[PDB]
Amino acid sequence: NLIEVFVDGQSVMVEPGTTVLQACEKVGMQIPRFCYHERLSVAGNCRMCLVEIEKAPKVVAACAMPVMKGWNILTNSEKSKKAREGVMEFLLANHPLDCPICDQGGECDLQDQSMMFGSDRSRFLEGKRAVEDKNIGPLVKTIMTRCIQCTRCIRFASEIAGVDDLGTTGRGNDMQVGTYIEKMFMSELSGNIIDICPVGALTSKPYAFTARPWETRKTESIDVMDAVGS
Amino acid sequence: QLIAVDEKLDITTLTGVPEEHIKTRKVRIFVPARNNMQSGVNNTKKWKMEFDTRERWENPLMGWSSTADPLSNLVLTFSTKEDAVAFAEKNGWSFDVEERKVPKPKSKSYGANFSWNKRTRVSTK
Amino acid sequence: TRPTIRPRNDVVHKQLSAFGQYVAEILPKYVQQVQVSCFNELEIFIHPDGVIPVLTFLRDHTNAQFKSLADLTAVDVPTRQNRFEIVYNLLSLRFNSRIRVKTYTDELTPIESSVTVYKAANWYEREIWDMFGVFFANHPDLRRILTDYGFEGHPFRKDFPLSGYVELRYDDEVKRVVAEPVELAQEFRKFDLNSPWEAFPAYRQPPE
Amino acid sequence: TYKFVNMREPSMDMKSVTDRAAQTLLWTELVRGLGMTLSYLFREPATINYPFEKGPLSPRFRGEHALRRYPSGEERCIACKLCEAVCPAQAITIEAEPRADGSRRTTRYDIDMTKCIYCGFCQEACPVDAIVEGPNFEFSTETHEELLYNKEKLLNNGDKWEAEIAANIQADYLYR
Amino acid sequence: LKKTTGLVGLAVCETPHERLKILYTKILDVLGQIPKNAAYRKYTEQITNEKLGMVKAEPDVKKLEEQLQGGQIEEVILQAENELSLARKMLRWKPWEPLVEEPPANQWKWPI
Amino acid sequence: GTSVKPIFSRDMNEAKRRVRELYRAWYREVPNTVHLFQLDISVKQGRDKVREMFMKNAHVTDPRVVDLLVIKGKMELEETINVWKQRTHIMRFFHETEAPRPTDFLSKFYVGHDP
Amino acid sequence: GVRTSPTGEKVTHTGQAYDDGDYRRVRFSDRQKEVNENFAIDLIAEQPVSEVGSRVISCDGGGGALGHPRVYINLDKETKTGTCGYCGLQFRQPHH
Amino acid sequence: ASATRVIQLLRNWASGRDLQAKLQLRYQEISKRTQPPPKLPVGPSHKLSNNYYCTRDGRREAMPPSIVMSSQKTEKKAVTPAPPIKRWELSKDQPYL
Ligand code: SF4
Ligand code: SF4
Ligand code: SF4
Ligand code: SF4
Ligand code: FES
Ligand SMILES: [Mg+2]
Ligand SMILES: [Zn+2]
């Protein structure tokens, strides 16, 4: 049967094996996340989803930790806020200043989560990291200095598209996401990496520089290019 | 005492809208789809009523995008589908209602990435 | 100390809460709800037919001498059954305070005119009618105040378009100004500015 | 505290009564007004000899708009549309595309000077100091269309007023 | 005694105490018609008896004004008249009755 | 609510009475409006326009809506009587400078995308 | 470097030029077409390529606070120059 | 300014005040149009440690208004919105004009 957990003291009935992030979503709280995608596997590396359990001295990765009976999840606690601020601080410390020239622009998860969960000032007094851009076809434009090594594109590529030509090379702060060779990521499902990349590292090349998200009007229609009716 | 009106509410004669934009307009009541470029779901909370798209042409001078439809930018926010339907009915516009699409609950397990005998094992991290 | 955070005033908060309890006890027939905002502003939500008694009490009572009608306006919320929300802001000089009284109404339900309590209610209610379509029952002279002569529709409603439906120009054939359907050389560009990430946890609503 | 503007009362003694009677019969305060006007007549006027003498201005002055360049000659604007987003009057229209060398550069940059309120938000929001409100204000036109600027006109304004704009930005950029 | 009250249209009263006693007695007489359990009657009776006690124990007008803390004695008289008229109106209105009608399910919700 | 608060007129009979009273008030005013504003229209044209404006709301079956309509009609009349309006608005009632909008499907198809 | 269309109308730096049969060319009759003669692409081509002995360079456009936001360019791919895209400036490691 | 003494004396007699003490035209007494460069102060929240935004987030301290009374849900003394305003004291600087 369902077990009883608590989110900020509010009782929730969840199935065994449900994660902390899913319990908070069920109660109505969307925990900030970068590497977590519901359609993909659980990676738990960006560490942005760390939350505090009421009696646990250590924060837990909400996207990977299954809930136990009688767990009180403190979503808006001081420890959770400090953890989110620290993770955002590291991300933006190594992130480059490209927002005006970056197509992700006003629809960026890094920007929005920085404005909602991170600090507003920088303590980084050193130089930043620069990463050589790759070329993976005429559809996806890669500016890899903006990558946050969230491994969404790798996981999507392998699991969904059945193509394992993406991965991380090297280790440490020098880890780079790409192909390691001049190979184009050509597949019939290669725009979804543009969609799911939380930052502007992977962007649409035909759409490059043309518009900004706040200007666009969204019309909900269907697809006719095939018989799927997407 | 207090009178009773056993008839549907209709304020079209009082709103002042032209008959063309009363009769030939079909609004769309729906919950907006999540912007696929972001994982945030806070913009998919409230129902929205929006009108149908009309013609836009190019200005002969300066090449701007002209219009002739007053209700082009008119978008209304409603807390409930019933509230939006009642508003549309009392204002007399036609309406198409689309049901809210909520993601189905999914079973996620970190340990499935290292299955001993299942295909769920991942080849990289 | 926190230099960037506005300080709170517990004394004023407690005084306003006590006075809200006082008025709620005095007038149970109309007072539906009482609130005190965290920046020390008292609000009273009453039944729409209690406007005259509540305003007369808050004006003439010795402990509530709200002589001055600071403001009177309406707020349009289409998603509610009673969309229009009539707001009265009152100032008490003797006790150096302010109060707010909020009632509700829809298109076809009149609201009793409060010109017998405050004289500024005359023009304030004329403006409310002109801009929202709310009719006030016993108004000495209820007519449009701000819109053009013969203007159709009430501009401040949420469902009234920003540019309206008609525009004016001088037509030389008829030697007079004419009103023609609106047509913009450059259409107003609608921006979707809301971020999809929740900003304030304290105001989160139950998913329901 | 407070003070009374008109609460005095005149003394009813014979000398004061006679003084008031003399003021009534002999228009003393009217003569005082005449004397003040005569003083102003003999003073020096404050009129400047326009257009040969120009009124004072400051480096922060908001005038005609301009699009600037880097010293290399490359345009500063990167088509980020921050000015278009922040423009209160929606007087800026921008359309961009990748250039022949792949740069993020605008193809259309229009400012409607009959719609702009000259509020200066565009030069505040610009992260590259591309769009500026220059010092020129004598640009009245005989036709409406001449006030609908485009990218060519704004670049011409920048090239025409670059020295003064650069000097003003150097003078006032430490307050920004 | 004093030349003016400092307010335009507010005449000086040469008999403040008698007028105040008369007005407070009239207010108390009107409040007797209101039902005992009504909360308007209790508070108004309390404040009226509190203020009526001060006017009968202080013959000096200035010290009485300082005790009442209601502006000048003319302003106090005007407020007593307003309170009397309000008491009559409240006797007509009968607002001690239970709530006329509860609002709809979501009428004061915000944001919405 | 089942017991809706009436503005006045209670049922539809008194609302019709008010409609007829307002119609008489407008009808007796058209000669004065033509004379004072120096309109170039006929008195018959003004009466026909008043009749048409009354008839475009003939389908209303709600007494409150009818009461609001007659209130706004009295407002419009008092604007005309006091010469608050000009010839501009009185002629705005006539749409004298609009091209005849096509109403057939074929003409609408030819001119543009308008339904 | 301005160029002339076959209809005799100068082309702007965006390639704008009305067609031969376009009626909108009548607006320039008895008047002039506002065209800027300086092309940013040509000028930035005229600018040379810098050579610095480091894998990562930092560009701010010069002037400090008067320039563009500071960015870092990775000079690892020797087949091409690293271009700061705020100002279109090319840097290169010394090969050979 | 630049004027003859006779005209200045005539102005002083007609106006009754020494005009040269307080004129209405500016003669080199105003600050020069060129000024040394400034260096503005940085601010209170520009520290490198013990400065977390969660401890100084003004917006997140805002709270929904407290519901004092809701119909849905001894002898107490009557109260007032606030203590009555104290009488204003007449100005010692210049009580009467
Ligand atoms: S990915 Fe986001 S944070 Fe990074 S440059 Fe682009 S908009 Fe800015
Ligand atoms: S390129 Fe994008 S999706 Fe891939 S790991 Fe980097 S941030 Fe994630
Ligand atoms: S000054 Fe203000 S109104 Fe004018 S273009 Fe700039 S942002 Fe727009
Ligand atoms: S803010 Fe500056 S860089 Fe951005 S689009 Fe406007 S002018 Fe160009
Ligand atoms: S969302 Fe959980 S660690 Fe990334
Ligand atoms: Mg992306
Ligand atoms: Zn640069």
Does C20 reach chain E within 8 Å, measured CB to CB?
no
Q: D52-69 burial, b if ≥16 CB within 10 A, otherwise e?
A: eeeeeeebeeebbbbbbb
Torsion region of B32: left, alpha or beta (phi above 0 gives left; psi -120 to 50 gives alpha): beta
Alpha carbon of H94: minimum distance to chain A alpha carbons (Å): 51
Pairing of strands B47-50, C176-181: unpaired
Pair B77, B30: CB distance under 8 Å: no
Instruction: Tell me, yes or no, whether chains F and A touch by having 3 or more C-beta pairs under 8 A.
Output: no
Taking CB atoms within 8 Å and a gap of at least 24, the contacts of A124-127 are A124/A92, A124/A93, A127/G56, A127/G58, A127/G72
Can you tell me the distance from the alpha carbon of C63 to that of A29, in angstroms, rounded to the nearest whole number? 46
CATH number, domain containing residue G52: 2.60.260.40
Q: Ligand 1 pocket: which of A95, A97, A144 to mutate (most atoms <8 Å of CB)?
A: A95
Cα separations in angstroms, A102 against A110, G14, G26, G83: 12, 22, 40, 15
Give the number of other CB atoms < 10 A from CB of residue D154: 24
Question: 10 Å Cβ neighbour count for G96?
Answer: 2
Task: Find chain E residues with C-beta within 8 A of C31's C-beta.
Answer: 99
Q: Which two tokens stand for residue G19?
A: 């067609």
Please tell me the total number of residues recorded for chain B in this structure. 125
The span from the CA of C25 to the CA of E37, in Å, is 11
Which residues of chain A does H48 touch, with a Cβ-Cβ cutoff of 8 Å? 123
Contacts of A126 (CB under 8 A, 6+ apart): none
Indicate if ligand 2 lies below 6 Å from the C-beta of A199: yes
Q: Give the ranges where H35-82 is alpha helix by DSSP (H).
A: none
Chain H residue at shortest CA distance from E41: H78
B65 shares contact with chain A (CB less than 8 Å): no
- Expressed in angstroms and rounded, the spacing between residue C69 Cα and the centre of ligand 4 is 47
Structure tokens belonging to residue D8: 């005095």
Residue of A95, A122, A132 to mutate for G, most G C-beta atoms under 10 A = A132
The C-alpha of C36 sits at a distance from chain H's nearest C-alpha, in angstroms, of 5
Out of B1, B3, B55, the one facing F11 most closely (by C-beta) is B3
What domains lie within chain B, and their CATH numbers? Answer: 19-113 (3.30.160.190)
CB of residue A65 inside a 6 A radius of ligand 5:
no
d(CA A95, CA A72) in angstroms, rounded, equals: 34
Contact E107, C81 (CB under 8 A): yes
Nearest to B35 by CA among A36, A223, A213: A213
3-class DSSP string for A25-93: HHHCCCCCCCCCCCCCCCCCCCCCCEEEECCCCCCEECCCCECCCCCEEECCCHHHHHHHHHHHHHHHH
A66 vs A17: CA distance, rounded Å: 5
Starting at the earlier edge strand, list the strands of the sheet with G89-92: G50-51, G89-92, G82-84
Binding site membership of A111 for ligand 1 (Cβ less than 6 Å): yes
Q: Please indicate whether, in this complex, the C-beta atoms of H95 and D4 are within 8 angstroms of each other.
A: yes
One-letter amino acid identity for G48? Answer: P
Sort out which chain C residues have CB atoms less than 8 A from E89's CB and list them.
53, 56
Q: In what order do the strands lie in the sheet with D92-98?
A: D92-98, D104-112, D148-149
> What span, in angstroms and rounded, lies between the C-alpha atoms of A118 and A33?
13
* Residue-by-residue DSSP string for D149-173: E-HHHHHHHHHHSHHHHHHHHHHHG
Q: Is B96 helix (H, G, I), strand (E, B) or coil?
A: strand
Longest Cα separation, chain C: 72
Question: What is the residue with the minimal CA distance to atom 5 of ligand 2?
Answer: A151
Structure tokens at A52: 């505090």
B-C interface: how many C-beta pairs under 8 angstroms? 92
Across-strand partners of A19? A66
Question: What number of residues does chain F have?
Answer: 115
Q: How far is the CA of G40 from the centre of ligand 3 (A)?
A: 25
Task: Report the gap between the CA of A122 and the closest CA in chain G (Å).
Answer: 14
Please say whether the beta carbons of C38 and H59 come within 8 A: no
Centre of ligand 2 to C-alpha A136, Å, is 14
Q: Do H15 and D39 touch (CB under 8 A)?
A: yes
Q: Which residues of G are annotated as a binding site for Zn(2+)?
A: 59, 68, 84, 87
- Give the span between the Cα atoms of E76 and E23, in whole angstroms: 10
Q: Which of the residues C45, C61, C208 would you substitute to probe the E interface, choosing the one with the greatest number of E C-beta atoms within 10 Å?
A: C61
- Chain F hits for C173, CB-CB cut-off 8 Å, are 97
Residue D48 CA to residue D51 CA, distance in Å, equals 9
Nearest to C19 by CA among C105, C106, C92, C126: C92
Give residue F25's Cα distance to chain centre. Answer: 13
DSSP state letters, G3-39: EE-TTS-EE-TT-----TT-GGGGGGTTS--------
Residue pair B47/B29 in contact by the 8 Å Cβ criterion = yes
Shortest Cα–Cα distance, C187 to chain B (Å)? 5
CB C108 within 8 A of CB B11: yes
A195 close to A203: Cβ distance less than 8 angstroms = no
Instruction: State the smallest CA–CA distance between residue B79 and chain E in angstroms.
Output: 6
Cβ of D96 within 8 Å of Cβ of A105? The answer is no
| Inter-chain contacts counted by CB atoms under 8 A, chains A and B | 63
CB contact at 8 A, D107 and B63: no
Contacts of D112 (CB under 8 A, 6+ apart): C186, D91, D93, D147, D148, D149
Task: Tell me the β-bridge partners of C73.
Answer: C87
Nearest by CB: C176 against F65, F85, F87? F87
Chain-centre distance for alpha carbon C74: 3
**Closest-CA residue to F18 (of F82, F71, F83, F88):** F71
Separation of CA D75 and ligand 3 centre (Å): 20
Q: Whose CA is nearest to atom 2 of ligand 4?
A: D126
Strands G71-74, C84-92: parallel, antiparallel or unpaired by DSSP? unpaired
Question: CB–CB of A120 and H53 under 8 A?
Answer: yes
As a whole number of angstroms, the distance between CA A120 and CA H53 comes to 7
Quick check: E75 and H84 in contact, CB under 8 A? no
Place of tokens 């090239």: D159
Chain C nearest-CA residue for E68:
C62
- Spatial separation of the C-alpha atoms in residues D153 and D64, rounded to whole Å: 11
Which one, of A168, A134, A174, lies nearest residue G55 by Cα? A174
Chain D contacts of G86, Cβ < 8 Å?
A: 78, 128
Closest approach atom of ligand 5 to CA A63: 2
User: How many Å lie between the alpha carbon of C193 and the closest alpha carbon of chain A?
Assistant: 6
Q: Are B and F touching by the rule of 3+ CB pairs within 8 Å?
A: yes
Full residue range of the structural domain in which residue G57 is found:
40-92
Cβ–Cβ contacts within 10 Å for residue C48, how many?
Answer: 21
Does ligand 1 lie within 6 Å of residue A202's CB atom?
Answer: no
| D122 Cβ closer than 6 Å to some ligand 3 atom | yes
Distance CA C21, CA C44 (A): 10
Say if ligand 5 is within 6 A of residue A33 CB.
yes
Q: Is H63 on the interface with A (CB under 8 A)?
A: no
Q: How far is the CA of A166 from the centre of ligand 2 (A)?
A: 11
Cross-strand pairs, B49: B29, B76
Cβ-based neighbour number of residue D35 at 10 Å: 16
Ligand 6 centroid to residue A92 C-alpha, Å? 17
Q: Residue H78: which of E46, E70, E71 has the nearest Cβ?
A: E46
Rounded to whole angstroms, the Cα distance separating A11 from A53 reads 14
- Smallest CA-to-CA distance from D60 within D123, D111, D113 is with D123
Please tell me the distance from the alpha carbon of residue E51 to that of residue E73, in angstroms, as a whole number: 12
Q: Which two tokens stand for residue A168?
A: 């991380």
Q: Which residues contact G36 (CB under 8 A, 6 or more apart)?
A: D152, D155, D156, D159, G12, G13
Return d(Cα A152, Cα G94) in angstroms, integer: 36
Cα–Cα distance measured from residue C85 to residue C93, given in angstroms and rounded to the nearest whole number: 26
Tell me which residues of chain A, numbers 94 to 123, contact chain C at a CB-CB cutoff of 8 Å: 112-113, 115-116
Q: What is the residue-wise DSSP string for C168-203? A: EEEETTTTEEEEEE--BSSPPPP-----SS---GGG
